[PDB]
């Protein structure tokens, strides 16, 4: 369960 790993 990861955090917001979407690219910046």
């Amino acid at each position: 369960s990861a955090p917001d790993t979407r690219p910046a």
């Epitope: 369960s1 955090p3 917001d4 790993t5 910046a8």
Partner: single-chain antibody, 226 residues
Framework: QVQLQESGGGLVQPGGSMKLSCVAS????????MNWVRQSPEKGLEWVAE??????????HYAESVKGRFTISRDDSKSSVYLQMNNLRAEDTGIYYC????????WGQGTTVTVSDIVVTQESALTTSPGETVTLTCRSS?????????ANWVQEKPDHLFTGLIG???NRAPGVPARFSGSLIGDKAALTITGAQTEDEAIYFC?????????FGGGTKLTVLG
């Protein structure tokens, strides 16, 4: 120049309520999770709540210090996030920031609210000089830091001006100067400034992720002398 602008704070009585707002521009707001984080002199920087995407049915998580009392919401059509704060207590006093993106690149200017168990450890202070290489570290009380903690590093400059430097252990946030890098070293997260500049004198905080919440470290005061 992405912008997050908070509003709503003030001077409030214990037992009361208020709602903070935050309006975003410059990035696709609706693709990112958003967070509220607060700063007080005592208790330092403290993650409060997060809200995820429409595709996650806007799922939320809260710090245990505010669960039952606070509600985070977003309005993607107005690119806004909100924090409804009920049953306020003295300990809720602080500066409140909306922040997000990979994972804490963008911070609002903050709104002041005056009301009247993992420890993450950082060096209290380090001193360096222009042109030197300095490394700050971030230890977890649970054991080793791994990439599963998605270590973030954030810089605080005067006056309570926060900017994210590093997310996901070693990903530099957009527009962050190349002298900053993230690593894992000796089972700690670390931030390195390779060639410190006078303007890097600042307070640096790390954040580590544990499954569904962030714990901030207490911050490191970096002095750049000479």
């Amino acid at each position: 120049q992405v912008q997050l602008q908070e509003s709503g704070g003030g001077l409030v009585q214990p037992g009361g309520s208020m709602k903070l707002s935050c309006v975003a521009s410059g990035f696709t707001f609706s693709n990112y999770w958003m967070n509220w984080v607060r700063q007080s002199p005592e208790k330092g920087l403290e993650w409060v709540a997060e809200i995820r995407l429409k595709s996650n049915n806007y799922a939320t998580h809260y710090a245990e210090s505010v669960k039952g009392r606070f509600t985070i919401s977003r309005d993607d059509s107005k690119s806004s996030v909100y924090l409804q704060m009920n049953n306020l207590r003295a300990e809720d006093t602080g500066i409140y920031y909306c922040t997000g993106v990979g994972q804490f690149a963008y911070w609002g200017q903050g709104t002041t609210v005056t009301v009247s168990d993992i420890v993450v450890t950082q060096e209290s202070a380090l001193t360096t000089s222009p042109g030197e290489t300095v490394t700050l570290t971030c230890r977890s009380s649970t054991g080793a830091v791994t990439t599963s903690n998605y270590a973030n590093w954030v810089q605080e400059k005067p006056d309570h001006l926060f900017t994210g430097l590093i997310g996901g252990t070693n990903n530099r946030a957009p527009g962050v100067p190349a002298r900053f890098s993230g690593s894992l070293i000796g089972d700690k997260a670390a931030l390195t400034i390779t060639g410190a500049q006078t303007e890097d004198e600042a307070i640096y905080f790390c954040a580590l992720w544990y499954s569904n919440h962030w714990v901030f470290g207490g911050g490191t005061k970096l002095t750049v002398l000479g």
